[PDB]
RNA sequence: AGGACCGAACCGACUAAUGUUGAAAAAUUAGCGGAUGACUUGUGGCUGGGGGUGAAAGGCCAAUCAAACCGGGAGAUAGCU
RNA sequence: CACAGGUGGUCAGGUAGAGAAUACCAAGGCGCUUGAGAGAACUCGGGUGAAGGAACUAGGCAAAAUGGUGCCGUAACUUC
RNA sequence: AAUUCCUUGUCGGGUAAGUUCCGACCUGCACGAAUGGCGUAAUGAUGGCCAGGCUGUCUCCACCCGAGACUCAGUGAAAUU
RNA sequence: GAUGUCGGCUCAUCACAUCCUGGGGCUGAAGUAGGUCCCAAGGGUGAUGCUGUUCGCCAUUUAAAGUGGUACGCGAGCUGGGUUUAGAACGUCGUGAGACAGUUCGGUCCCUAUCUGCCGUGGGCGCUGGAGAACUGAGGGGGGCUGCUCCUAGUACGAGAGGACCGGAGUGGACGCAUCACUGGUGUUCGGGUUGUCAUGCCAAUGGCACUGCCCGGUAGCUAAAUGCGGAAGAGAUAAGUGCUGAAAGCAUCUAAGCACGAAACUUGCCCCGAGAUGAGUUCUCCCUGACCCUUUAAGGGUCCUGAAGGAACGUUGAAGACGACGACGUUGAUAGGCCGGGUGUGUAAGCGCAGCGAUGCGUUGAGCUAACCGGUACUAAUGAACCGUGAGGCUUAAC
C-alpha cells in the first residue's frame, strides 16, 4: 500500500533525489524556466516554492538556511534579492507547469516549469 | 515452461485483438494562434490558452 | 427495523466516570430523506429508498434530478434501500433522523473495507511462511503446494490464492451504541467499523441481538 | 508474554532463582501467559538449602511481566523483568512464605489472595 | 474533524499541571477495593510524554521494592486524580529511555533551575 | 631464530546465498585459509600416448582423458534399432 | 560478444591511520551505449523491530554478536 | 570403538524429557601390536557433543529502503511444437 | 528415445470403519464416572527432548491429540538430513582387482507457463430505441469448534465418601473478520547528538561522503503483540431412538391407515457475491416526435439538416489501484501542490551579549525548524472547444 503517502521516489535513492532537486531548484531559480519531465516538475514545486516563501524575509538565519538547502550562494542571493521582493504579495503558487509534449529518446511526458512572473 | 503444441494463427489474432492503438480524435484549437495541439499542452509555436508562453 | 445511512468521521474515546475508556467510532448521520417507497403492488416487495447529504447541482445528471424531483427532496450523495418490516411504514419525502436509534443498544455497521490492493497469500489468508534460511530457495512467502497430484489433476475451485484484498462490503455486527446525539447528528458506537474516514456506513439495529 | 523456553525470575523465598517456562497451560495451542496465568516450569537455579531443588517440575503463576498489563483506563503497567511465584503442583498454593517485589491487581481472584496479602505493594 | 475535536474538548481536564520529561511527579490514581475507593500514589520520574490532546499520556518510571516499574498514565483519565511535581529535572532529550539501563548513581538527574 | 604469529599485495578456495536459456561452458557477493615459505610469479627450455608427469585424485597432459588430438586401414563390425 | 572473468613489471601525493588496511580527498580519470513512469503480490540485496530467546533445523545453516591500544590479571594440562 | 549385528545392550552423568554425547562394564557377530597397538602437549576452513553470549533461525511475522517484476517508448531472443 | 526416492516444510482435499463435541439403546448403569453398540463428517483434532527418520520412546499439554484414501497427496512449491555415483577409512570377505542396504566422514536440486486448472482483474458483444440510477434473488460461496468458573445445589443420589441431570449466567483458549481510539513496532520523506575526512576564501555556520557513516528520538500511513466484533438463538424436515391410538392375527403390537417427538448432519436463519438467471428480470427517472432520393422493394440503402439524455476523452487527483477499473473534482471550483494558521515531532537554532584562560556554560529562548496530519485559502494547475452517442423504437395475437 501507499495510503496517504507523499513524495515520488522517481527510481532513485534518497541521496540521489535530494541532490537532484537541489540542482534542479538552482536551475529554476537562475533560469526562471526549465524543461523537465512532467513528474520531476510537480516535485520541484514542493522544493522550490518553500525556498521563495523562505526568501520572503531576509535575515542571516534565513539566508544560511537557504544556503543549506541550495548550496549555491548566487542562488541564495537571487532568492533573497529578487524573488523574495518580487513575490512579496503572492500566497504560494510561484511556479507554473506547462505540459509540452513528449521526449524523443524515451517518450517521456515533458513539461516546462517557470516562475509565474518571469520578468513579464 | 513451454508449449506442447504450436498455437495457431487464430490464437495469435485472438490474443492481439486487444493490441490496437487508439487515436486522439480530439485536437484542440488555440484561440489566438488557431493551431491544433494536444488538450492541456502548449502548441508547437509556444502558445497555450492563446498566449505566448515560450517564444 | 430500518437503518440509517451515515458517514465515518473517525475514532476517539469516551472516559466513563468509573475510569473506563471506551473506543468509539463517530458516525455522523444527517437527515435521511425518503425518496421512494416500494410496496407489493408495484415493486413486489416492501422497502424505502433514502438519500442523504448534499450533492453539487452541476454533478446531478438529470435522470437523477428528475428522480429526486418526484420525491420533492434535495439531491443527496446516493440512494440506499432498506427492506421494511411488517409494521413499519414511511412516506415519500419523510425525513428520518438519527434519534431513530435513541434506544437501540446494538447496531450492525456496514461499510467498504480499506483496499489493500493485490495481496499475497500470507497477508490475504494468513499462510504460514516457509523457512527464511536452511536452504530455502526463492520460496519464502510463496504459497507452497496448490493441489494433490495426477488424480485430481486440477486445482479445486475456491483454492486460496493471492489476489485483490479489501475494498469490499463488510458488516460488523452487534456494536454497542454508546451515545446518540440528536443535535449534532452523531452516533457513537463502541469499536471499529469498516472503511476509511469519510466513507459511507449503513447502520442498522442488530439483527442477531 | 511468557512462552515456552522463557526464563523467569522467582518472586518468592521458595529457594529458586531462575525457572524456565515449560508449558503455557490452560488451552490447546495457547501461546502466551500474561500476569495471573498459571504456567508449568522447571527449576534451573536454586539456592543450596531451599525448599525446592534444581530440576523440579512444578506450576507457577506469573506475577510480573515486562510486556505488562493494560488497565481498563487504557493505561499500561510494565516491569523490568518477568517473575513468577512457585505454586504447589497439586493444590496451586504458593510454596513460599515471603513475596518480593510489587505485584499487580490481576491477582485479586480468591485464588491468589495469599500472594496479594504477602506482597509488599499493590 | 471539527466534530471529533469538540467531542474531545468536552472531555479534557482543564487543570493538568505543566511538567517536562525528567521531572519527578507523583500521580494519585483511584483504586477500588470492592466497595472501598482509595487514592494511591505512584511517584517517579517522567521519562516520556505523548501529548495528543485528549489522548495525551506520560510514562513515569519508578524503582519499587527492589525492581523498576513504569506506568503509562493516560492523562485526562478520571482514574488519574491529580498530578503533582516534586522536583524539576534538567535533561536535554524528550524521551529518557536510556534511564532503563541506568541504576543507582548512574540514574541521577540534575535539578533544573 | 622460526616450513613462528597477526595482517594487505600475492597465492589459494572451507561455508552460505545468488546465478543455472548466467555478466561467466565454475563466476559474483559476504565471510574463509596461507602469506620468508615444502612459497609465489615472469621468460625461455625439457619430458608424448600404453607414453609422459603426478606430496596419488585414475589427477593432469590446450573447456577432451581406466589411455590425448589429427589423418588413414575404413563404407571395421552391429543375429541390434 | 564493446563479455562483472584472466593478464607480468614500474610510479605512487594529502588528512586521519602501524600500514600499500580503511575512510575522505588531490593530480588525473570517469558516471559503466536503453531510457521515462508507477510505487501490486512475489523475488533479490539491505535497514529496523514489542514480548520471548534456538522454542528453528538434519545441524545455530544463515543472521546477530565479539573486535583497538595501554595496563592489571589468567586455569587444567604440557613435549616446558 | 571411523570396528558391536542384535542394539536405542546395561549402568552412571548431563535434560523437564537424550537412538547422539561423555564416563564405565565386557557379552570383541567381526580390536590388537610398523597393511603398527596404546596414549599424547600443540595444531587443524577436521568429526561428534554441551554451555554462556547473541539474535527475525523460530513463536509469527510488521514496516521501511533500494534493484527487478507492472506500465509507456526503442530494440528484440529461447527451449518447444 | 527417463513415470524423481523417504521424511520434514508449505498448502491441502475427500471418505467414515467418529478422537472430541451432539443425539440415543442396553448395562454386571445408585451418583460421579464408565463399558458396549447404534445414529451423526458441522466444526475442531498439540507444541517438545532423542534420532535422518515415518514410527517409536519420552516429558508436559488438550475437549480431543481420529483412522484411512489422495502417484505411502504435494521437489515445473521448498528442503535434501537419509538413501543411491566418483575421494577416504574401519570391521568383514576375497590371493587379488574389488565387494558388503554392514558402518564412518565428505560430497552441483535446472525450468522466463502455451494449454487446462485456479485466484484476481479488465475489454468486446448480447440482453431488441438510447441513457442514468436503485433493486429482486435463481443460484453460489463463507461461517458453523470448545474449555473453565459460578448459580441451581452439597439439592437429587449415596451407608458414608463422593456428587448430578436439566436450566441459566459470566470469563477464556484457538480461529476468523474489521480497525488504528489506545499500547507498541516501523518510520533512508522530520528534529537532534556524534566520529573521520573533503569542500563552501577563512572564523563561525553549514553541506557532501563513509551501510540512513554511526546513532537517539519520532508525524502520517501501514501494522500486532493492540482493540472491537462474530460464529448463534429460532424455525422446517428428519437419523438412531422413544412414543400415541390401532387392526392384520377377540390378545397383543410405534405401523399396515392415521397422529406425535427427536442431533453440531440436512434446509433456512447470520454474512458476502450475484440477471451472460442468453430463463439476460423489475422499479423509478431522463432524452430524441426534420426533410429528401433510389432500388431487391424491405426491420432496404444513401443524401442533407440535425446530435439530445448521457457517455468517453483530456486535465487536477484519491485512505482506489500492477494495468485497466473504481471514486472525487475542473473556475458556477477546494481536486492536487503551494501559502496561511494550528497540531505533532525533536528539544532551548542562528546571530548577539555575558561569565570563564579556555573547552564550555548562561540569557535572548522551550527557542528554532517540523513529512505524508487538521482547519482554512484560488496563489499555480485543473480551457471555450472538440469527439462518441441520434431524430421516437419490429412483427403477431389478445385485452383495453
UniProtKB/Swiss-Prot annotation, chain A:
Record keyword Ribosomal protein present: yes
Coiled coil: none
Listed Pfam families: Ribosomal_L17
Gene Ontology molecular function, alphabetical: structural constituent of ribosome
Highest taxon, organism lineage: Bacteria
Cellular component GO terms held in the UniProt record: cytoplasm; cytosol; cytosolic large ribosomal subunit
Signal peptide: none
Keyword Nucleus: no
GO biological process: cytoplasmic translation; ribosomal large subunit assembly
Keywords annotated in UniProt: Ribonucleoprotein, Ribosomal protein
Family: Belongs to the bacterial ribosomal protein bL17 family.
Record note on quaternary structure: Part of the 50S ribosomal subunit. Contacts protein L32.
Function of the molecule: Requires L15 for assembly into the 50S subunit.
Name of the molecule in the record: Large ribosomal subunit protein bL17
Source organism: Escherichia coli (strain K12)
UniProtKB/Swiss-Prot annotation, chain B:
A GO molecular function held by the record: structural constituent of ribosome
UniProt KW keywords: Ribonucleoprotein, Ribosomal protein
Gene Ontology CC entries for this record: cytoplasm; cytosol; cytosolic large ribosomal subunit
Residue numbers spanned by region Disordered: 1-37
Short name of one Pfam family: Ribosomal_L32p
GO biological process: cytoplasmic translation; response to radiation; response to reactive oxygen species; ribosomal large subunit assembly
InterPro entries: Ribosomal_bL32, Ribosomal_bL32_bact, Ribosomal_zn-bd
Subunit organization: Part of the 50S ribosomal subunit. Contacts L17.
Xref: NCBIfam families: rpmF_bact (TIGR01031)
Family as reported in the entry's similarity comment: Belongs to the bacterial ribosomal protein bL32 family.
The protein's name in its UniProt record: Large ribosomal subunit protein bL32
Organism this protein belongs to: Escherichia coli (strain K12)
From Swiss-Prot, chain C:
Taxonomic superkingdom: Bacteria
InterPro entries registered for this protein in UniProt: Ribosomal_uL3, Ribosomal_uL3_bac/org-type, Ribosomal_uL3_CS, Transl_B-barrel_sf
Pfam family, one: Ribosomal_L3
Disulfide bonds listed in the record: none
GO cellular component annotations of the record: cytoplasm; cytosol; cytosolic large ribosomal subunit
Purpose of the protein: One of two assembly initiator proteins, it binds directly near the 3'-end of the 23S rRNA, where it nucleates assembly of the 50S subunit.
Name of the protein in its database record: Large ribosomal subunit protein uL3
Organism classification: Bacteria, Pseudomonadati, Pseudomonadota, Gammaproteobacteria, Enterobacterales
Curated annotation (Swiss-Prot), chain D:
Signal peptide positions on this chain: none
Gene Ontology terms, MF aspect: large ribosomal subunit rRNA binding; structural constituent of ribosome
UniProt xrefs under InterPro entries: Ribosomal_uL14, Ribosomal_uL14_bac-type, Ribosomal_uL14_CS, Ribosomal_uL14_sf
A Pfam family assignment: Ribosomal_L14
GO terms for cellular component: cytoplasm; cytosol; cytosolic large ribosomal subunit
One GO biological process term: cytoplasmic translation
Record protein name field: Large ribosomal subunit protein uL14
Impact when changing residue 97 to A: Reduced RsfS binding
Subunit structure: Part of the 50S ribosomal subunit. Forms a cluster with proteins L3 and L19. Forms two bridges to the 30S subunit in the 70S ribosome, contacting the 16S rRNA. In pre-50S ribosomal subunits interacts with RsfS, which may inhibit association with the 30S subunit.
Family indicated by similarity: Belongs to the universal ribosomal protein uL14 family.
Primary role: Binds to 23S rRNA. Forms part of two intersubunit bridges in the 70S ribosome.
HAMAP family the record matches: Ribosomal_uL14 (MF_01367)
Keywords: Ribonucleoprotein, Ribosomal protein, RNA-binding, rRNA-binding
